Design a protein around this nucleic acid. Structure first.
Ligand SMILES: Nc1ncnc2c1ncn2[C@@H]1O[C@H](COP(=O)(O)OP(=O)(O)OP(O)(O)=S)[C@@H](O)[C@H]1O
Ligand SMILES: Nc1ncnc2c1ncn2[C@@H]1O[C@H](COP(=O)(O)OP(=O)(O)OP(O)(O)=S)[C@@H](O)[C@H]1O
Ligand SMILES: Nc1ncnc2c1ncn2[C@@H]1O[C@H](COP(=O)(O)OP(=O)(O)O)[C@@H](O)[C@H]1O
Ligand SMILES: N[C@@H](CCC(=O)O)C(=O)O
Ligand SMILES: C[C@@H](O)[C@H](N)C(=O)O
Ligand SMILES: [Mg+2]
Ligand SMILES: [Mg+2]
Lengths: 325, 232, 354, 315
DNA sequence: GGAAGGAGCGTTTTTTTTTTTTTTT
DNA sequence: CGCTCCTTCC
């Protein structure tokens, strides 16, 4: 059954040993369960860093394989209004364990989607029944959580996945599958991941699909770029060089050719050029101001559609004017 | 738990509780009460302190009674709140910061604070922060910006440069394009206050403040729509 | 009797008399109407777009398209707010103006139009055996006034149910039409009639009505004053003829819409005096104009172009005026209350002039 | 199992509560006197409001706490019907108490009460003030309607100072026999930002994690409050420094763009050094960036552009 | 015969979704 | 909060 699943779900960690890139948080929670002194928890972090996986693995470790009987899980797909908090959560938190298996666990995944009234109602539920129950909140946006709820929870930050953890997970996936990955392909995959393991797994699955003979074919960086349709570093470098050195006609022709060669999107080129320019050594600081403002404006305009050729010419002109200072 | 934007859910008053027919009925008389002024409140607090002279003298706070009474009379027009505050201060052997119930300011009072400023506070940032903290309901409502737009000309009876008016109106127009974020209201109010403070002078005569006339326009538009449907 | 705008309304493609190329294109569309794509006619207001749409429908079906009745369709929002829409129907086509429902226009697209698209039209064959099916024609007036949500809701309705429905949308500008909708329609440009054609139509009406005309220059002046709007041209012709005992003369005044003269007076006042009090008076004039349900964008455009016609102003003043007009037109498009933006535009103009 | 330290070491008596020394002394005076009036307790989270009210009620009512105290909070039903029936019946109850003692109705998180219930409470307070007294606890005192505020003595709690937090932390460490260092306690206090619940939670987390509370060990799990990082970013005199802070300290640590912009607005609201014109221009730029983020463009480029515009405003 | 102090003025009010309370059943 | 007409206070 696991074979038919998408790789993002097929490779979900089952034990806390399989969660990488969060060594400090993982060690703290593991030792907390070892000492049986789990406090109310908050897991704050960006998408695909292992919060849900970590909390489910911790529940499995605490309650073995029967965690579903003494764990109450609620997420944004369920209604969690003030009535739900008053009735369902309160009754679960105020009832004894199934077999006196220590304390009960309530997981509020994506709690940043809950209303202010429900969060306010949750305060005294959390406080009163701490002996019999422990709460776990998961979030990507802290500004949606009320100050009282944040104060009641011990905070743990899930950082963007470090490179080494991604490499180890990729090696595990490659040994699981009959797949080969090139070092340059792995470097490109990590670069495009942006610290999200879901993106890595999805792109790897697409790359395996792209291979004509996955039993023997090796995934190269070209395969990754084809699957993602993203620009190559060489294309970005050539476009930037033409913009910063050649005339308007030559730069326009170069941009058009680079885009038409592989059907690249202008937003991807803008992002790549911004990343490249972030490392440029600028002797004039107004240049950075103009670059940032104009490129942000162009990105915002592109987000709403518009004319593609005019936007590309705008990017060229903005870069040239900024560097003319 | 409300998340409703009806009249009554914003303000509890005769207008929101009654209707026009009842209020304008010839057999109904309406009398409006004002907060108790300082003279009466001071007199009554002095009487209360005199009635409790023995305990105040025993606790040594008697000598300081005036020092607090004039404060209380200066803080609120609520007789019950003033008496409660006096009792709390007197019964306490220690020293605490005397405070009364907070009193909300009216719509025109808020408009005047935004335009001319506040006597008590010389720092505009503190005044704006306090106004937003304690008067969020009034400031967030879209009619406050209309009132500012329609009353900013009252300054000096409209005898200031057209540049300042243009700046104020341009800022309000920019705020109208901010999807009602708190930053928009803060920016608009701060711009208006700063512009009016930059030209404040002792020798100025101000005009009368009036409510915006948008509702009249809406009523006329509804009548026009009815007439247009009839013609169609 | 009926107004001369409707009295002499052409009722067929062959009855058209201006923009012959557009007439030929419409006739070519009606040759094999079985595979007629969705149509989007765009052009200046009052140029005869609805007339041409009705002529095409008449050619496809027949004169019966002009037999129109009106029904009231009731809709209920999530908050239980009950409201109504007018549906103009003929035996072969339907007419709707969802923009009349404001922000609720999307509901009309989601409930009414979809249902119309879902109900296949079938009828017993008079002579042959078996049923016969015909697609329904639907006209959407003021398409450019639809909210983006309604336009999005139109997409899959147009695509999936193409067999049962063919949409004919009409608009004055395509700028507010989302790209997906423009992609799904055959775009037809409807140019305004030239002054000569307007004068010819007016002279034909004059001959029909036995109105004594001193010279044909009066018709040319009326056409110039109408700025290419034939409906306005006919309305002013009728008003002038009635006010002059059906005997027009070169001295007869040319009647213009009252709000236009009001805007001209506002422009003159703005140019003359520039101060805060003048701005308040201008605000009063603007509020009076808005009380008559004149669109804010139309007010801004008319005021801008009236200001640009003033001779005393110089090139720099006009350039600043057009800059401010563009900026505040964008602000109106993205805004909620129009008074802020109109007052800001007038204040900026006063600052630049002074 | 062993309770978390936040709940395990909740004070039972007023003497164990630190901070707001004058306020706690007044509460002790009331407790030892008896004539408790209607009171409102306002302040920021985790400073002892609930603990103070509960300790005062316990000390006042002695053995009669069970039958003389009615506690209601946002997790219970508190609608108009509840005021009409349960609170009314409790206030009508004839209970024999020591002279100067009254029944106490604790309304925790009273700010969340509905308008109808608050209006209904007026008559209850007017009728049953002789034998019943109300203790409201809230974070925003203005969220209680003025007619109710008129009957109550106001009591505003201030944020706890580093000294009291250190004192109570040392008491907890002595009770738990925890090895520590001075720098570790300083780091814990700095990260707590005056909230003692967070201070105790972080102390427990650090003690579990490594056993020894050092600054380096404290910062392994607990992070510096991001509002201070945002303030440092905004006050940077060079655009490069602001961009570097935004990248290393905020973006690379997983902070969402929406959180960053909201914190930037909050911090800019309290920048005393900057001028008013510059402050309002910065607020405008932050609002524009927030509007762009809400539409879906939550990219690092937008935040960099916002920083560039703010720096331009400074110049 | 000047302050200083105070009163009265300056007003009206649906709409998108989503959530919540209240009331009668 | 500012302007405007009435007492009140010394
Ligand atoms: N630390 C990790 N170690 C290994 N795989 C991981 C890790 N984090 C994420 N993954 C992979 O990504 C998938 C999604 O992880 P989740 O924990 O559900 O994401 P998340 O942190 O909950 O993000 P949100 O908040 O739900 S968008 C998992 O099933 C794994 O395949
Ligand atoms: N002044 C204090 N002295 C000692 N411990 C304190 C103090 N303030 C808070 N604590 C600790 O923090 C816990 C929570 O205190 P509470 O009084 O419930 O918080 P709070 O002030 O009510 O915040 P809110 O408004 O309920 S979010 C207590 O049980 C103590 O362990
Ligand atoms: N070819 C024509 N000959 C005579 N009158 C015409 C012709 N085309 C349009 N008109 C007149 O123009 C008027 C308005 O046209 P209409 O289709 O309503 O404009 P719109 O394109 O704004 O819908 C009609 O009343 C009609 O009489
Ligand atoms: N416009 C800049 C050049 C910027 C750069 O080359 O970094 C001059 O000097
Ligand atoms: C090229 C020139 O403008 C340089 N950037 C300075 O000076
Ligand atoms: Mg998750
Ligand atoms: Mg509390």
């Amino acid at each position: 059954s696991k074979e038919n699943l998408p790789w993002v779900e097929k490779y979900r960690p089952e034990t806390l040993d399989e969660v990488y890139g969060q060594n400090e948080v993982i060690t703290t929670v593991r030792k907390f369960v070892d000492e049986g002194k789990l406090p109310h928890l908050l897991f704050y972090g960006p998408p695909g860093t292992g919060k849900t996986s970590t909390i489910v693995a911790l529940a499995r470790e605490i309650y073995g394989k029967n965690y579903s009987n003494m764990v109450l899980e609620l997420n944004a797909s369920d209604d969690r209004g003030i009535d739900v908090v008053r009735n369902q959560i309160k009754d679960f938190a105020s009832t004894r364990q199934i077999f006196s298996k220590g304390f009960k666990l309530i997981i509020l995944d994506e709690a940043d989607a809950m209303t202010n009234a429900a969060q306010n109602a949750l305060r005294r539920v959390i406080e009163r029944y701490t002996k019999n129950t422990r709460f776990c909140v998961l979030a990507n946006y802290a500004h949606k959580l009320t100050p009282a709820l944040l104060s009641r929870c011990t905070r743990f930050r899930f950082q963007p996945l470090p490179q080494e953890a991604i490499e180890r997970r990729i090696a595990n996936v490659l040994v699981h599958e009959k797949l080969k990955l090139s070092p340059n392909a792995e470097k490109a995959l990590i670069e495009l991941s942006n610290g999200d393991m879901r993106r890595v797994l999805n792109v790897l699955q697409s790359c395996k699909a792209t291979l004509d003979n996955p039993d023997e074919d090796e995934i190269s960086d070209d395969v990754i770029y084809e699957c993602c349709g993203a620009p190559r570093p060489s294309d970005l470098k050539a476009v930037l060089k033409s913009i910063l050195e050649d005339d308007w006609g030559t730069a326009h022709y170069t941009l058009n050719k680079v885009r038409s060669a592989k059907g690249l999107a202008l937003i991807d080129l803008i992002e790549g050029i911004v990343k490249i320019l972030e490392d440029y050594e600028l002797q004039n600081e107004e240049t950075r101001v103009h670059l940032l403002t104009k490129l942000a404006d162009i990105e915002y305009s592109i987000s709403k559609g518009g004319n593609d050729q005019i936007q590309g010419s705008a990017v060229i002109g903005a870069i040239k004017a900024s560097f003319e200072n | 738990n409300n998340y409703r934007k009806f009249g009554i859910d914003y303000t509890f008053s005769a207008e929101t509780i009654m209707n026009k027919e009842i209020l304008m009925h010839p057999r109904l008389k309406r009398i409006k009460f004002n907060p108790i002024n300082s003279t009466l409140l001071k007199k009554h607090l002095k009487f209360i302190c005199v009635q409790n002279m023995k305990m105040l003298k025993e606790k040594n706070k008697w000598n300081k009674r005036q020092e607090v009474i004039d404060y209380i009379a200066q803080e609120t027009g609520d007789i019950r709140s003033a008496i409660t505050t006096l009792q709390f201060w007197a019964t306490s052997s220690g020293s605490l910061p005397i405070s009364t119930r907070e009193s909300t300011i009216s719509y025109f009072h808020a408009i005047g604070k935004v335009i001319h400023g506040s006597h008590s506070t010389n720092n505009d940032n503190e005044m704006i922060n306090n106004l937003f903290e304690n008067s969020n309901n009034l400031l967030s409502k879209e009619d406050f910006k209309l009132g500012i737009l329609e009353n900013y000309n009252t300054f000096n009876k409209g005898e200031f440069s057209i540049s300042d008016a243009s700046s104020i109106v341009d800022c309000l127009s920019e705020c109208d394009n901010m999807n009602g974020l708190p930053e928009s209201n803060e920016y608009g109010l701060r711009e208006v206050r700063k512009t009016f403070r930059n030209i404040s002078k002792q020798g100025h005569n101000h005009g009368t403040v009036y409510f915006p006339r948008e509702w009249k326009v809406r009523k006329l538009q509804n009548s026009f729509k009815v007439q247009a449907e009839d013609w169609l | 009797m009926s107004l001369w705008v409707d009295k002499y309304r052409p009722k067929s493609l062959n009855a058209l008399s201006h923009n012959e190329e557009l007439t030929n294109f419409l006739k070519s569309l009606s040759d094999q109407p079985r595979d007629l794509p969705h149509l989007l006619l765009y052009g200046p207001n009052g140029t005869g777009k609805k007339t041409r749409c009705m002529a095409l429908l008449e050619s496809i079906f027949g004169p019966g398209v002009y037999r129109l009745k009106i029904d009231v369709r009731q809709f209920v929002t999530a908050s239980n707010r009950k409201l109504e829409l007018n549906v103009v129907s003929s035996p072969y086509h339907l007419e709707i103006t969802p923009s009349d429902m404001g922000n609720n226009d999307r509901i009309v697209i989601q409930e009414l139009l979809k249902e119309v698209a879902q109900m296949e039209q079938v009828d017993f064959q008079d002579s042959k055996d078996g049923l016969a099916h015909r697609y329904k024609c639907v006209i959407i007036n003021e398409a450019n006034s639809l909210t983006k949500d309604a336009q999005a809701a139109l997409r899959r309705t147009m695509e999936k149910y193409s067999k049962n429905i063919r949409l004919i949308m009409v608009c004055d500008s395509m700028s507010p039409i989302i790209a997906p909708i423009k992609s799904r329609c055959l775009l037809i440009r409807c140019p305004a009639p030239s002054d000569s054609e307007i004068s010819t139509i007016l002279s034909d009406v004059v001959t029909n009505e036995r109105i004594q005309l001193e010279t044909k220059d009066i018709l040319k002046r009326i056409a110039q004053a109408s700025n290419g709007n034939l409906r306005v041209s006919l309305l002013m012709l009728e008003s002038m003829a009635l006010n002059n005992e059906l005997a027009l003369k070169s001295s007869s005044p040319i009647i213009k819409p009252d709000w236009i003269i009001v805007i001209h007076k506002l422009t003159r006042k703005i140019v003359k005096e520039r101060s805060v009090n003048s701005l308040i008076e201008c605000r009063a004039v603007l509020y009076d104009l808005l009380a008559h349900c004149i669109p804010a964008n139309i007010i801004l455009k008319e005021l801008t172009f009236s200001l640009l016609d003033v001779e005393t102003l110089n090139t720099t003043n006009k350039s600043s005026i057009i800059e401010y007009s563009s900026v505040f037109d964008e602000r109106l498009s993205l805004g909620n209350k129009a008074i802020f933006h109109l007052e800001g535009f007038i204040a900026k103009v006063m600052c630049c002039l002074d | 199992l062993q309770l978390p330290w936040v709940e395990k070491y909740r004070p039972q008596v007023l003497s164990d509560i630190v901070g707001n020394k004058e306020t706690i002394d007044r509460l002790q005076q009331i407790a030892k006197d008896g004539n408790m009036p209607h009171m409102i307790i306002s302040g920021m989270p985790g400073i002892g409001k609930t603990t103070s009210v509960h300790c005062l009620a316990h000390e006042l009512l002695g053995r009669s706490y069970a039958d003389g105290v009615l506690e209601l909070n946002a997790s219970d039903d508190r609608g108009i019907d509840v005021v009409r029936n349960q609170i009314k019946h409790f206030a009508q109850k004839k209970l024999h108490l020591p002279p100067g003692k009254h029944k106490i109705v604790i309304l925790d998180e009273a700010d969340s009460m509905t308008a109808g219930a608050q209006q209904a409470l007026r008559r209850t307070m007017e009728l049953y003030s002789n034998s019943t007294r109300f203790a409201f606890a809230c974070n925003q005192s203005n969220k209680i309607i003025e007619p109710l505020q008129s009957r109550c003595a106001i009591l505003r709690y201030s944020k706890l100072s580093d000294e009291d937090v250190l004192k109570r932390l040392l008491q907890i460490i002595k009770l738990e026999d925890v090895k520590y260092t001075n720098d570790g306690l300083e780091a814990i206090i700095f990260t707590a930002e005056g909230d003692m619940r967070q201070a105790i939670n972080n102390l427990q987390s650090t003690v579990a994690g490594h056993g020894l509370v050092n600054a380096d060990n404290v910062f392994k799990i607990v992070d510096s409050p991001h509002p201070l990082i945002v303030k440092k970013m905004l006050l940077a005199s060079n655009l490069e420094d602001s961009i570097q802070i935004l990248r290393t300290d905020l973006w690379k640590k997983g902070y969402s763009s929406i959180d960053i912009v909201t914190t930037s607005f909050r911090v800019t609201k309290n920048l005393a050094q900057v001028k008013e014109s510059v402050r309002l221009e910065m607020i405008k730029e932050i609002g524009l960036t927030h509007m762009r983020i809400l539409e879906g463009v939550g990219t690092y480029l937008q935040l960099a552009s916002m920083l560039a515009k703010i720096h331009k405003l400074n110049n």
